[PDB]
Design a protein around this ligand. Structure first.
Ligand code: NA
Length: 875
């Protein structure tokens, strides 16, 4: 019935599953993130975002960006997809014959190199979707170690300065292969003499050992290589000579010379090296190594290590001992701790200068994807962790950090638009992409999303994609307000939209109050300095903000965690604590106007207040309206108070009564509506000013229980009840207008009920006749079903996964335009010239190979023209 209703999904926020991989394109300046279900999300400037779903739901291992128009995606099943930034759909799927171990791709090259578990090397033509005839067998088994087990290729790396040389590394040996000459140029083998200490994790020091290589890299000058070995040795070799310059550790040097009386002098438990990256600064002559360390036990053992080697000495005029000094005495060294003990799973440097040098040229920020799906950012080389939501598109802000609670608010646009006008995001990181303008028809009411994270930060933005709403967001830091560093998890938060006020309650029970206002433009701050519960925090506002959500007062009650917070639209703040405390704050002041325990007033065993609501209507049979406060208790009781206007503009509190409404506690959602007009009865400033008129507005209050809804009337015994099959997670009163006759604006007030299992109904009032009975299309996390908010205009916002939210609209007829995807590829961007071997460093010894020359070797003289428009486009 009521065909004006149909469940329609309007917006999605965040990512649908756990991030598992990442990649970045400097040429187009786009950032791609891969989920475990095979989704690829490409983000750009402001709020550019394109979602591509691969045919299989398998996980993603690696990506690279090719030519600035291609995105190569490799899954767990060793299937390689090619995606386009111009046509924005899957271009090619390839089933590569073998188990892939090492991949390399260059910015200006149309080929990608694949090593296998069986040791063979193969080359794939991304531009033309063909396998090339160039194939190399297992070189270690073929030339050096015939009797060894079949060694997989540990690492393949294109030379940073010459596409004609490829660094290949096997388990017990590494080498440099030339594609032009089809031969092995130089080979290095790491062997330890007896009694050699080896690395930290060396085993059986007495006997001769040949540890497996775990990773090899080229130096930015391309004349030096590093081999990390399973003992955590770090051996620096010279690519051309075959000489072993040194073997060092992160802490000690010369680990290869035997030492009969060696003793491990380390007060820190040794950490297995996970991966090593060789980053370079603006001048490639300035380089540093970042090493990630595998965790032992479970405690914070994933820390980064940076070795800034500074100016690399000139190659031609320094001996091997000079390189030994240069690598053995680092220019600077520092360890970057990780704020969490969650293991690191992927590290992606974000280049700022150019996409060469393995995508690690002058990285200003390092994106770390952890095992729990988080995304962290390290400023480099400073090492400062940043979680500012303005660095990345708002969809990424659901990952950095994890959003502990979320809510949506129906804000009147009258001042909301003026607020978002000067709240534009101006310091995003991604620069590419051109955002499609999706103009929304103007409306009286808009929607805001508000999220609180475990960091102690609250992010607020608009849920529409309009001209102003799209790139506008506020961020408030609870840490700077309280001068605190730990125990900052946000638990609950309440938003008064009519005057733009906020109350944020954290795991320690502290509640901080924020208000929208202009700016007033110490290091010993603490909540324990003074004795009063209300602590002044006005002067602790962020420096550079001219106007925004600033803190006014912090609440340090020392009474425990909070069970209910509500910030009214008329200056009142209601705070309830798990111990039983109930506390009323007048923002006029500031002042406390009521502070009492509710276990000494209840007739039941009700421990704490779970919901606080403000209404302005007639109590009982008083014949006139006043300021009334309704609270629900965890045992199904309801306590109604009056806030009487007292002398001097202050306010008293008079307890009217407490009645056991239902046995199905807790009481978590309170709403109200007038009996005749059926408009919202919740308190507002104009309604408060209207009290002098002597007006009387008898009303009915909807109280939500565990799985029942009660229609009750203040000051009376009669009530009505409705029961559900499953417990109710989110509800609200929605006031919608329907036109049926000719232009008649017939308003209809209905209640939107959502159960934790995902079912949604829409009933009328007060008869509670069903108008919708549908389900949310996808299953929802029972942990996060309850963080839903019902909006004024029939919309319902549900948290569905740990990282994603969904804003549904329950009005079938909505001014919906055809979906428009955004533009990723912008033509005319030039890829900088690939760096070549400097003649002043190593004269001769090189055979210059142009890209077309390499195409002729790998694909043949008769290489077919591509079937893609991108190949012609990307030139
Ligand atoms: Na937006």
């Amino acid at each position: 019935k009521n065909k004006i209703f149909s469940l329609a999904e309007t917006n999605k926020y965040g990512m649908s599953s756990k991030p598992i991989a990442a990649a970045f394109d400097f040429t187009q300046n786009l950032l791609a993130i891969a989920t475990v279900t095979g989704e690829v999300h490409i983000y750009g400037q402001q709020q550019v975002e394109v979602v591509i779903k691969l045919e299989d739901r398998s996980a993603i291992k690696e990506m690279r960006f090719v030519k600035g128009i291609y995105l190569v995606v490799i899954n767990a099943k060793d299937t390689v997809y090619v995606l386009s930034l111009y046509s924005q759909k899957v271009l090619t799927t390839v089933f590569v014959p073998g188990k892939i171990t090492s991949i390399d791709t260059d910015a200006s090259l149309d080929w990608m190199l694949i090593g296998l578990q069986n040791g063979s090397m193969i080359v794939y033509d991304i531009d033309r979707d063909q396998l090339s005839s160039f194939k190399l067998d297992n070189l270690q088994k073929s030339s050096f170690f015939p009797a060894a087990r079949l060694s997989p290729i540990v690492s393949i790396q294109w030379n940073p300065r010459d596409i004609g040389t490829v660094l290949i590394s096997y388990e017990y040996v590494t080498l440099t292969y030339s594609l032009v000459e089809n031969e092995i140029k130089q080979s290095f083998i790491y062997e330890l003499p007896p009694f050699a200490p080896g690395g930290d994790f060396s085993e059986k020091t007495n006997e001769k050992r040949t540890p497996k290589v775990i990773q090899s890299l080229y130096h930015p000058n391309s004349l030096h290589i590093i081999t990390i070995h399973e003992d955590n040795s770090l051996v620096f070799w010279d690519a051309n000579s075959g000489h072993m310059i040194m073997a060092r550790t992160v802490f000690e040097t010369e680990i290869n010379v035997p030492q009969p009386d060696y003793i491990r002098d380390s007060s820190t438990n040794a950490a297995k090296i996970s991966k090593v990256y060789w980053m370079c600064e603006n001048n490639p002559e300035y380089t540093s190594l970042l090493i990630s360390h595998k965790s032992i036990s479970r405690g914070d053992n994933q820390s980064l290590t940076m070795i800034d080697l500074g100016y690399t000495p000139r190659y031609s005029i320094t001996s091997y001992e000079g390189m030994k000094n240069y690598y053995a005495n680092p220019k600077q060294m520092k360890i970057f701790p990780l704020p969490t003990n969650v293991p690191i799973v992927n590290i992606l440097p974000i280049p700022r200068q150019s996409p060469y040098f393995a995508g690690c040229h002058n990285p200003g920020l390092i994106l770390l994807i952890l095992g729990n799906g988080e995304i962290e950012t390290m400023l480099y080389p400073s090492g400062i962790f940043t979680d500012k939501a303005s660095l990345f598109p708002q969809n990424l802000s659901w990952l950095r950090p994890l959003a502990t609670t979320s809510m949506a608010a129906s804000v009147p646009n009258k001042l909301w638009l003026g607020a978002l006008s000067a709240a534009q995001n101006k310091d995003y990181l991604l620069k590419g992409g051109v955002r499609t303008k999706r103009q929304k028809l103007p409306a009286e009411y808009g929607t805001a999303f508000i999220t609180g994270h475990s960091n102690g930060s609250v992010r607020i933005y608009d849920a529409s994609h309009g001209d102003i709403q799209d790139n506008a967001s506020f961020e408030v830091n609870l840490s700077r307000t309280l001068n605190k560093a730990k125990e900052l998890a946000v638990d609950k938060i309440s938003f008064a939209a009519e005057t733009l006020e906020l109350a944020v309650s954290i795991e320690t029970g502290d509640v901080v109050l924020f208000k929208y206002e202009v700016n007033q433009f110490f290091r010993r701050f603490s909540l324990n300095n003074t004795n009063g519960v209300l602590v002044d925090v006005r002067d602790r506002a962020p420096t550079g903000v001219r106007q925004g959500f600033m803190p006014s007062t912090a609440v340090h009650a020392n009474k425990g965690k909070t069970s209910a917070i509500n910030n009214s639209n008329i200056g009142f703040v209601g705070i309830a604590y798990a111990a039983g405390s109930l506390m009323l704050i007048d923002r006029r002041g500031p002042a406390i106007i009521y502070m009492e325990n509710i276990r000494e007033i209840s007739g039941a065993q009700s421990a704490c207040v779970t919901c606080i609501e403000f209404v302005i209507m007639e109590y009982g049979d008083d014949g006139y309206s006043s300021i009334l406060m309704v609270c629900g208790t965890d045992m199904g009781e309801v306590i109604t108070y009056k806030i009487l206007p007292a002398s001097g503009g202050k306010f008293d509190v008079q307890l009217m009564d407490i009645t056991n409404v239902t046995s199905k506690g807790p009481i978590h959602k309170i709403d109200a509506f007038s009996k005749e007009t059926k408009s919202s009865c919740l308190a507002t400033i104009p309604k408060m000013q209207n009290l002098s008129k002597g007006l009387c507005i008898p009303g009915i209050v909807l109280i939500t229980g565990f799985d029942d809804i009660r229609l009750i009337t203040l000051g009376k015994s009669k009530s009505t009840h409705k029961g559900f099959k499953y417990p109710l997670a989110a509800t609200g009163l929605s006031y919608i207008s329907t036109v049926e006759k000719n232009n008649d604006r017939k308003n209809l007030t209905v209640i939107i009920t959502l159960e934790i299992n995902g079912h949604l109904r829409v009933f009328t009032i007060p008869d509670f006749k069903e108008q919708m009975s549908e389900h949310i299309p996808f299953p929802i996390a029972a942990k996060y079903i309850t963080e839903s908010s019902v909006l004024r205009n029939g919309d319902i916002a549900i948290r569905v996964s740990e990282f994603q939210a969904s804003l549904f609209s329950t009005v079938k007829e909505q001014d919906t335009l055809a979906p428009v995807s955004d533009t990723l590829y912008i033509n005319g961007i030039r890829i900088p010239y690939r760096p070549q071997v400097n003649s002043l460093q190593w004269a001769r010894g090189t055979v210059y190979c142009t890209p077309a020359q390499l195409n002729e070797l790998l694909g043949g003289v008769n290489r077919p023209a591509s079937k893609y428009k991108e190949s012609i486009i990307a030139e």
